[PDB]
Design a protein around this ligand. Structure first.
Ligand SMILES: CCCCCCCCCCCCCCCCCC(=O)OC[C@H](CO[C@@H]1O[C@H](CO[C@H]2O[C@H](CO)[C@H](O)[C@H](O)[C@H]2O)[C@H](O)[C@H](O)[C@H]1O)OC(=O)CCCCCCCCCCCCCCCCC
Ligand code: CLA
Ligand code: CLA
Ligand code: CLA
Ligand code: CLA
Ligand code: CLA
Ligand code: CLA
Ligand SMILES: CCCCCCCCCCCCCCCC(=O)OC[C@H](COP(=O)(O)OC[C@@H](O)CO)OC(=O)CCCCCCCCCCCCCCC
Ligand SMILES: CC1=C(/C=C/C(C)=C/C=C/C(C)=C/C=C/C=C(C)/C=C/C=C(C)/C=C/C2=C(C)CCCC2(C)C)C(C)(C)CCC1
Ligand SMILES: CC1=C(/C=C/C(C)=C/C=C/C(C)=C/C=C/C=C(C)/C=C/C=C(C)/C=C/C2=C(C)CCCC2(C)C)C(C)(C)CCC1
Ligand SMILES: CCCCCCCCCCCCO[C@@H]1O[C@H](CO)[C@@H](O[C@H]2O[C@H](CO)[C@@H](O)[C@H](O)[C@H]2O)[C@H](O)[C@H]1O
Ligand SMILES: CCCCCCCS[C@@H]1O[C@H](CO)[C@@H](O)[C@H](O)[C@H]1O
Ligand SMILES: [Cl-]
Lengths: 38, 451, 81, 334, 342, 137
């Protein structure tokens, strides 16, 4: 059970980091029209 | 008559306030006038409540929501939350009401008579939404103000009478907080608690030292932050992450407010420290627990050994164990064993409910309180017929906790919706396609087929 | 359009109001009196608050025969002293 | 192009057959988790002690259920609002007895469906669309939050959350009516107007557009072949449709603006379902439907029954029977 | 050949504010009478002699609790004509005996016929296909099945729905407790049709509104549309890509999309109508026999099916005596089913 | 049916003397009973102890008898257990305990009489409904 806990904790942290860093990576510019959005 | 029709502004009448986006003077007017409405309602509602107030009925039988707020701050009440002097309520009402005139005046002046834009009038009060520096400076001012507000509560608790403490020894009483919790471990420890059952996150705060100390931390944080934002301008990583526009900022605040609305809903539903039950009525868990207690007391007086009475399911009729072993009340109320209240805690020992204390130490004031709370459970109909849905007419009662929680859930929800609306629109408008797809440049047509 | 005078035209004309500032309140008063004179009760056969039950009775005067229903109702009404 | 950049370009790519996106990065694993656990549980989960009284209810197919009666059973009343992940149980057997699957499924599902809303916004932005489809989706989503999360929070237990099954849904509905008189609540009534109305306008719009299709086909072929995907011209005559419907009622009760019309078609059911969701969410804090029980009294003081009192008799029937072994004390306070 | 029939035809089909037509001769009096009957009844008429209930504003009911209630069970399926053998011309007695119920229901039925005939007539004059009338077949089937067929299979008009908000709610609860109507697959198809309909309404409206071509300068996009324009006002291609990528599949044919919007709720209502026809004969989807056999033999076996049955038994026992006064049900406290404590 | 003087005539004391209330007294009684008592005694039952109700038959068998005005007025002054054995003012609202049940502070003798009258008249009107509980709703 402790192994399962750590596994899930790590998985969740990984995915959430992808989400956050993902939206931090110049997201407003990922649109088809105007790119300069800063 | 600038931007006051659909032709010039581009906006129909039903989105008329959008015509205000770049007219800073008029927008200021709208805001000041609106603040006027808020303060007005505070004053008038307080006076209304005061005029309908009978000191010898519990507040919670009287449809009161603002007076309980004032009484919690320590004004007008004594031991057990008995009302000793209604005059502070009166003051709080009157002052708020008077103030609303001033604000109103300001609002109206800026709204119709004053400069429509401020930028030419004053570079200080004037702002461009896209000026990140100016925006963070205004933000800084407002953070400093909020910080002062938080410090005001601390000043009341420590230097001006104290606060009402439902947990004070000998029944509730107003108490001066002399040693607020300053240990960051405790304070932010609350911030790191699970929001689930038995943990309850920040809703779980159950003593006034923590409330006060937490507000000291909040005040210092807000003031320091306000200075930080006045003195700085957003960094590159921040600059690339956000949309920088009025509607965007509005949408951010809308999300903020939604979140706060939901939190407020849970606070008023579960917490009986900063929302004392003497004023607001018992919480749902509290009333359920109180029913169990009431019948344990009654049947024990009749000769039942409550510790050994087996119920129809095989679980104890009166007492059972929680999933981690603590002795708790039985029946459906098994769900509410996380409840803590001053009327129950004397019966608590290291292993939960103590059978010996149950047998020997139950005072009449406890029986009284359990009966009262059990018969004032926060259940009632929309036309204020108290009790379960199947109850007959007789008791004119809906709990303050229900009114507050429901109202604030509705508001928080619609504010989340507003957040989506305005954030999506802000994105579309910043990128240039909020009015529709350009026919000569439809992006999808420039994309490969999916299949 | 289909020819009739537009509603905005009509309801903002002084004549419309000259007529209806009389006709409207007059109907309202006729409706009021219809209840207040107790005539509504007698027309529809609705019980007044003191006519649902006989003083000591607690049984509903339920109609139980198809072809004698009228006579049943008349009897239940008699039995109200 | 560095690996992070390449990855970000693939995630947000408008060329994937199914758009992934940043919200999709959370949505995919969570919905998969919810789905897999749901399927296994629905088929093979042993009985669950929903009400905490050691009276396990059989929800799965292998334990005596059909499609209609089967469910994933809500977690135990002894758990309440406590968080019960697998690693908090001593064994999978304990976890299953106590209704753990329900919690795993609904938390993963709610997270996933919220991210689904987000993803609708996201793809609208990548494609240069207007952004508000997700707002329409917020109505069924809020409703799912109401019955799986908000209502348990208010009542103090996930055991009172909607069971994941057909007959379980009916149970939840009946008990809800007993405890809150939802039928007499104006928000549920607005909900019913929302969906009845939505259905009405669905059929209406469909029938009017269909009635005014411009002739582009022969009688031996489906009229559908008269429209070609991507064609620039509209496929029906909105002026004829308007002429007809306008005559059916009166002219000014009919829409001649397609944008105005379609906005109405969006707004009506979304708003109504928002209210329906708010109903469940506010009855969660026990602000219940209208109580007119014994509202009409005669001159002496006799109770004159109305239809509200008959409703009360039915509700009492539900109340006394529901959870027949779970109550020791005379008032059902949660 | 321009005789009186053709002159009358001319007058009936004038383009006026409110179209009349031949169908209007049926529609207008019948719709007006059914509506006026309901308004009269809910304002002034009692249900004391038929149900033992107050049901009008005059008696103190509100808009939720007023009703025009069904006639007494003792009337059977009497047409309850005012000049009939029961009321015998007496208007007051006629109101007390529940005559307004059959009045409203019958004028209502003929009114509905009139409205559909109106749909056909106008469609034929304007030159559109009659799909709107066809779609309206569904409300007619529902009305006819619930207000006419159902009571006709039962003992009397009494068990038909009564015309009022709360009265209808009671109808719902009665159907759960007595018929186990939620368990009925025809009801389920009805629910699918209605909810699926609301879904199609919302998703189509939102899709159209969020794939608009920018055909104007304004921030209010409603102005940028003209009823006589040839061009589509929104991009079907972008809508299709969006939905293909969000949900896997998407519409590509507009005519099919709108036909489907007709088809879904219409079919749902027709299905629910068939199930109610069954309930007319008490031909219910009450039980799953296998379940009852297992549960009878095995007292540790419990499902949501058996739980819901216990609720039904409660509904029946606690509501029967007041809901069916003519039966004279006397149920002593001791025979009433109750769980522990409650 | 009407609220007649016969309906409003109730036992004043154990000796069989009666008093006739006014319609105003009765209504005042209803209002005051709703104010101070109904939270527990709605419809003539007792929520915190359902074994004891407010039916006349029950009140007659209390010690001392409470099926009359004097009995009920005394009860509201100094409440006892059903057998008269214990004084329960500390857990039951009364004039003796108006300090701990503050709603009792603004009740006058006239008011206790009104409340008593209401409690005695109600069963003459509602029959089994009074004290009956949900079975008779
Ligand atoms: C950016 C976004 C970030 C999101 C990231 C996701 C992280 C988790 C999100 C929140 C999930 C919450 C689930 C649990 C909800 C709940 O049971 O919340 C309850 C808790 C309170 O917990 C209770 O707290 C109580 C604390 O009181 C205790 O202390 C008191 C002191 O007076 C008393 O003594 C009392 O008796 C005593 O019990 C007890 O611990 C209870 O056991 C405990 O259950 O709320 C709280 O923690 C705080 C309030 C939580 C808010 C809930 C939001 C719901 C939003 C719905 C949105 C719908 C939108 C629709 C979209 C379309
Ligand atoms: C909190 C609510 C609120 C506030 C503060 C405002 C404020 C404003 N609106 Mg908005 N608006 C609102 C709600 C509000 N609105 C709502 C609900 C709608 C939908 C109908 C609109 C639709 C709308 C449109 C279409 C427009 C506005 C416009 C405006 C601005 C100018 C109005 C004007 O010049 O009229 C002049 C009106 C008068 C001179 C009549 C009297 C107005 C005064 C202020 C009332 C004062 C009464 C008060 C009791 C006096 C107390 C004095 C005392 C304190 C001494 C102003 C900032 C306009 C704008 O954007 O301008 C650029 C505009 O075109 N509004
Ligand atoms: C939302 C807050 C707010 C803001 C940012 C402004 C901003 C402005 N006002 Mg307006 N105004 C407001 C509210 C506001 N006002 C209110 C409430 C009133 C009614 C009293 C007015 C009545 C008013 C008039 C008649 C005029 C202005 C003018 C101005 C402009 C010049 C201000 C200046 O240089 O003063 C310098 C700064 C001071 C004099 C400081 C005064 C400090 C106050 C009086 C003491 C209390 C401060 C304390 C924080 C109050 C807490 C309140 C809180 C509880 C809500 C500036 C754009 C002028 C203008 O528009 O020029 C064309 C102008 O003629 N204001
Ligand atoms: C009114 C409140 C407020 C607002 C709107 C802002 C706004 C801003 N701040 Mg300021 N700040 C504030 C108060 C505020 N601040 C206070 C009181 C302080 C003192 C503590 C600061 C100290 C501060 C610093 C040091 C910096 C900012 C910066 C910024 C800018 C970047 C914001 C950002 O990227 O957040 C994005 C949010 C995050 C990065 C949070 C981490 C991600 C987690 C996972 C999100 C999830 C949290 C979760 C939902 C919360 C639940 C509760 C939780 C605590 C357990 C933005 C303009 C940045 C800047 O550019 O300054 C010029 C910056 O460097 N602020
Ligand atoms: C957070 C706000 C809040 C809360 C919790 C309360 C709570 C209460 N009020 Mg107070 N009050 C408020 C705001 C609030 N009020 C406001 C804004 C006003 C001015 C109108 C008042 C003026 C007022 C008076 C005069 C009285 C009260 C009273 C009461 C009590 C009885 C309530 C009742 O019976 O309502 C009945 C319930 C309703 C009427 C339901 C309203 C349904 C609304 C219309 C739904 C709206 C939904 C949403 C906003 C619309 C979205 C549309 C969408 C398309 C976007 C209760 C404690 C009474 C009392 O007992 O005082 C001691 C009383 O007499 N209030
Ligand atoms: C502080 C919060 C806030 C602020 C400052 C704004 C500001 C704005 N909104 Mg936003 N909005 C908000 C919250 C806010 N909104 C929330 C919480 C929602 C979710 C419901 C929305 C949903 C929304 C939509 C869908 C739209 C806007 C739009 C706008 C712009 C024009 C608004 C206007 O003129 O309305 C005019 C005001 C009216 C027409 C009257 C509204 C009447 C309501 C429904 C009454 C509700 C009943 C009441 C509560 C109780 C009954 C009272 C009755 C009995 C008398 C303006 C920038 C428009 C926009 O996009 O501009 C760019 C737009 O289309 N808003
Ligand atoms: C115009 C359309 C219309 C239709 C289709 C109906 C239909 C109905 N009405 Mg309604 N009604 C209407 C308009 C209409 N009404 C109007 C305008 C009024 C106000 C006057 C009423 C007032 C009214 C009342 C008070 C009642 C009805 C009732 C009825 C129902 C029974 C009618 C019946 O049996 O008559 C049968 C009559 C005919 C079929 C006429 C046909 C004539 C044939 C074709 C020619 C032969 C005639 C012959 C030459 C005459 C010889 C007579 C001689 C032997 C003595 C039926 C549903 C009854 C009801 O609802 O009970 C529930 C009822 O009590 N109606
Ligand atoms: C509910 C419907 C809401 C529609 C929008 C609200 C109207 C408001 C609106 O959208 O536009 C406002 C519109 C303004 O009319 P005008 O003054 O321009 O009238 C012009 C006429 O002369 C046209 O020739 O009002 C109307 O047309 C009539 C309004 C209802 C009048 C009721 C008449 C009732 C007639 C009898 C019923 C006939 C039923 C027949 C079918 C069975
Ligand atoms: C802009 C605008 C608007 C808005 C406005 C507003 C929002 C305003 C507000 C305003 C305000 C917000 C005002 C206020 C005022 C106040 C006042 C005026 C007060 C007074 C008071 C008094 C006088 C008092 C008295 C008393 C005393 C002292 C004692 C006790 C009792 C009594 C109460 C008697 C609108 C929407 C229309 C639209 C258009 C534009
Ligand atoms: C039966 C009968 C008959 C008939 C009669 C009639 C035809 C009647 C009519 C009547 C009518 C025709 C009535 C009406 C009424 C109406 C009313 C009573 C109304 C009310 C309303 C209101 C109250 C409103 C409300 C509202 C709404 C709904 C929404 C919007 C808002 C408001 C709030 C405004 C005859 C003689 C043939 C024969 C015998 C039998
Ligand atoms: C637990 C929550 C943790 C929250 C942490 C918040 C910290 C905020 C600062 C983090 C640093 C920001 O890092 C941000 O992301 C990536 C990292 O390669 C940078 O690099 C990015 O450049 C551009 C931005 O237009 C993108 O097109 C490109 O895909 C990416 O390589 C961004 O330019 C930078 O803005
Ligand atoms: C019902 C329809 C009956 C039609 S009747 C028809 O009407 C004509 C005038 O319109 C006459 O010329 C003709 O002789 C007559 O038979
Ligand atoms: Cl219990």
């Amino acid at each position: 059970m402790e192994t399962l806990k750590i596994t899930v904790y790590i998985v969740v942290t990984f995915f959430v980091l992808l989400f956050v860093f993902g939206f931090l990576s110049g997201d407003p510019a990922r649109n088809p029209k105007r790119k300069d959005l800063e | 008559a600038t931007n006051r029709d659909q032709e010039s502004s581009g906006f129909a009448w039903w989105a008329g306030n959008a015509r205000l986006i770049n007219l800073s003077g008029k927008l200021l007017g709208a805001h000041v006038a609106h603040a006027g409405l808020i303060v007005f309602w505070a004053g008038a509602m307080t006076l209304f409540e005061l005029a309908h107030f009978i000191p010898e009925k519990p507040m919670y039988e009287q449809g009161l929501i603002l007076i309980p707020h004032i009484a919690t701050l320590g004004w007008g009440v004594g031991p057990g939350g008995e009302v000793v002097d209604t005059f502070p309520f009166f003051v709080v009402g009157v002052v708020h009401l008077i103030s609303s005139a001033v604000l109103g005046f300001g609002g109206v002046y800026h709204a119709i008579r004053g400069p429509e834009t401020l930028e030419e009038y004053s570079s200080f009060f004037g702002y461009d939404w896209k000026d990140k520096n100016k925006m963070t400076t205004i933000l800084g001012f407002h953070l400093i103000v909020l910080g002062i507000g938080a410090l005001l509560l601390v000043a009341k608790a420590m230097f001006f009478g104290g606060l009402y403490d439902t947990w004070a020894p000998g029944g509730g009483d107003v108490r001066v907080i002399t040693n607020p919790t300053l240990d960051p471990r405790v304070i932010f420890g609350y911030l790191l608690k699970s929001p689930f059952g038995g943990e309850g996150w920040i809703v779980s705060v159950n003593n006034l030292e923590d409330v006060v100390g937490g507000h000291i931390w909040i005040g210092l944080i807000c003031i320091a932050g306000g200075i930080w934002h006045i003195l700085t301008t957003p960094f590159g990583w921040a600059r690339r992450a956000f949309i920088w526009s009025g509607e965007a900022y509005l949408s951010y605040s809308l999300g903020a407010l939604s979140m706060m609305g939901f939190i407020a809903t849970c606070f008023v539903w579960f917490n009986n420290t900063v929302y004392p039950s003497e004023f607001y009525g018992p919480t749902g868990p509290e009333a359920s627990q109180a029913q169990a207690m009431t019948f344990l007391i009654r049947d024990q007086k009749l000769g039942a050994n409550v510790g050994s009475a087996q119920g129809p399911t095989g679980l104890g009729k009166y007492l059972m164990r929680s999933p981690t072993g603590e002795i708790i009340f039985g029946g459906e109320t098994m769900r509410f064993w996380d409840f803590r209240g001053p009327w129950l805690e004397p019966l608590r020992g290291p292993n939960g409910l103590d059978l010996n204390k149950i047998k020997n130490d139950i005072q009449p004031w406890q029986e009284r309180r359990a009966a009262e709370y059990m018969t004032h459970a926060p259940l009632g109909s929309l036309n204020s017929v108290g009790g379960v849905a199947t109850e007959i007419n007789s008791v004119n009662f809906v709990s303050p906790r229900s009114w507050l929680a429901t109202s604030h859930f509705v508001l928080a929800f619609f504010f989340l919706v507003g957040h989506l609306w305005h954030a999506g629109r802000a994105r579309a408008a910043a990128a240039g396609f909020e009015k529709g797809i350009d026919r000569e440049s439809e992006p999808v047509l420039s994309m490969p087929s999916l299949d | 359009t289909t020819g009739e005078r537009p509603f905005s035209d009509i309801i903002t004309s002084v004549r419309y109001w000259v007529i209806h500032s009389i006709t409207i309140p007059a109907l309202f008063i006729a409706g009021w009196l219809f209840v207040s004179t107790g005539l509504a009760y007698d027309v529809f056969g609705t019980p007044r608050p003191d006519s649902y039950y006989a003083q000591e009775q607690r049984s509903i005067p339920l109609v139980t025969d198809r072809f004698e229903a009228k006579q049943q109702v008349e009897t239940f009404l008699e039995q109200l002293k | 192009a560095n690996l992070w950049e390449r990855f970000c370009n693939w995630v947000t790519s408008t060329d994937n057959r199914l758009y992934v996106g940043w919200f999709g990065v959370i949505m995919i694993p969570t919905l998969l988790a919810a789905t897999i656990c749901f399927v296994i549980a629905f088929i093979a989960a042993p009985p669950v002690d929903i009400d905490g009284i050691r009276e396990p209810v059989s929800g799965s197919l292998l334990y005596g259920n059909n499609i209609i009666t089967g469910a994933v059973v809500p977690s135990s009343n002894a758990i309440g609002l406590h968080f019960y992940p697998i690693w908090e149980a001593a064994s999978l057997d304990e976890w299953l007895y106590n209704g753990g699957p329900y919690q795993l499924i609904i938390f993963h599902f709610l997270l996933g469906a919220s991210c689904y809303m987000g993803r609708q916004w996201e793809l609208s932005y990548r494609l240069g669309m207007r952004p508000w489809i997700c707002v329409a989706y917020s109505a069924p989503l809020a409703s799912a939050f109401a019955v799986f999360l908000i209502y348990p929070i208010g009542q103090g237990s996930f055991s009172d959350g909607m069971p994941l099954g057909i007959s379980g849904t009916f149970n939840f509905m009946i008990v809800f009516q007993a405890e809150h008189n939802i039928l007499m609540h104006p928000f549920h009534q607005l909900g019913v107007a929302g969906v009845f109305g939505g259905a009405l306008f669905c059929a209406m719009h469909g029938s009017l557009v269909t009635s005014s299709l411009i002739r582009e086909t022969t009688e031996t072929e489906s009229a559908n072949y008269g429209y070609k995907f991507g064609q620039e011209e509209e496929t029906y005559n909105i002026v004829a449709a308007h002429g007809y419907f306008g005559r059916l009622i009166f002219q000014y009760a009919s829409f001649n603006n397609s944008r105005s019309l379609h906005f109405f078609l969006a707004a009506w059911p979304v708003v109504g379902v928002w209210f329906a969701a708010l109903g469940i969410s506010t009855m969660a804090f026990n602000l219940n439907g209208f109580n007119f029980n014994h509202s009409v009294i005669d001159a002496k003081g006799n109770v004159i029954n109305t239809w509200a009192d008959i409703i009360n008799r039915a509700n009492l029937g539900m109340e006394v029977m529901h959870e027949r072994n779970a109550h020791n004390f005379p008032l059902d306070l949660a | 050949e321009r005789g009186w029939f053709d002159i009358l035809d001319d007058w009936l089909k004038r383009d006026r504010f409110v179209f009349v037509g031949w169908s209007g001769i049926l529609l207008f009096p019948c719709a007006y009478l059914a509506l006026g009957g309901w308004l009269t009844g809910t304002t002034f008429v009692t249900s004391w002699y038929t149900h033992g209930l107050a049901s009008s504003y005059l008696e103190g009911c509100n808009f939720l609790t007023v009703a025009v209630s069904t006639p007494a069970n003792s009337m059977g399926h009497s047409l309850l004509l005012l000049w009939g053998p029961e009321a015998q011309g007496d208007f007051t007695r006629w109101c007390q005996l529940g005559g307004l119920w059959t009045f409203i229901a019958l004028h209502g039925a003929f009114g509905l016929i009139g409205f559909m005939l109106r749909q056909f007539e106008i469609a034929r004059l304007v030159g559109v296909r009659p799909y709107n009338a066809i779609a309206f077949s569904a409300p007619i089937a529902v009305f006819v099945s619930v207000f006419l067929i159902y009571p006709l299979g039962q003992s009397s008009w009494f068990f038909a729905p009564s015309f009022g908000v709360a009265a209808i709610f009671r109808f719902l609860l009665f159907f759960q407790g007595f018929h186990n109507w939620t368990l009925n697959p025809f009801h389920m198809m009805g629910v699918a049709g209605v909810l699926g309909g609301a879904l199609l309404c919302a998703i189509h409206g939102a899709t159209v509104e969020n794939t608009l071509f920018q055909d104007g300068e304004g921030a209010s996009t409603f102005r940028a549309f003209n009823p006589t324009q040839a061009e589509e006002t929104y991009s079907m291609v972008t809508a299709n890509r969006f939905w293909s990528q969000i949900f896997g599949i998407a519409f590509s044919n507009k005519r099919w999309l709108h036909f489907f919007m007709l088809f879904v709720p219409v079919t749902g209502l027709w299905m629910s109508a068939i199930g109610v026809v069954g309930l007319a004969l008490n031909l219910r989807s009450y039980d799953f026999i296998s379940q009852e056999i297992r549960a009878a033999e095995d007292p540790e076996f419990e499902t949501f099916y058996t739980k819901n049955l216990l609720l039904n038994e409660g509904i029946r026992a606690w509501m029967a005596p007041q809901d069916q006064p003519h039966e004279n049900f006397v149920f002593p406290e001791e025979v009433l089913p109750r769980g522990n404590a409650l | 049916a009407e609220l007649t003087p016969e309906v409003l005539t109730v036992p004043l004391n154990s000796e069989g003397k009666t008093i006739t209330l006014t319609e105003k007294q009765y209504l005042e009684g209803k209002r005051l009973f709703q104010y101070a008592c109904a939270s527990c005694h709605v419809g003539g039952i007792t929520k915190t102890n359902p074994s004891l109700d407010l039916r006349t038959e029950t009140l007659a068998l209390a010690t001392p008898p409470r099926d009359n005005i004097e009995g009920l007025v005394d009860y509201m002054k100094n409440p006892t257990t059903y057998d008269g054995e214990q004084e329960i003012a500390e857990v039951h609202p009364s004039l003796r305990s108006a300090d701990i049940f503050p709603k009792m502070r603004n009740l006058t003798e006239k008011d206790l009489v009104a409340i008593a009258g209401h409690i005695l008249v109600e069963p003459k009107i509602l029959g089994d409904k009074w004290g009956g509980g949900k079975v008779y709703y």
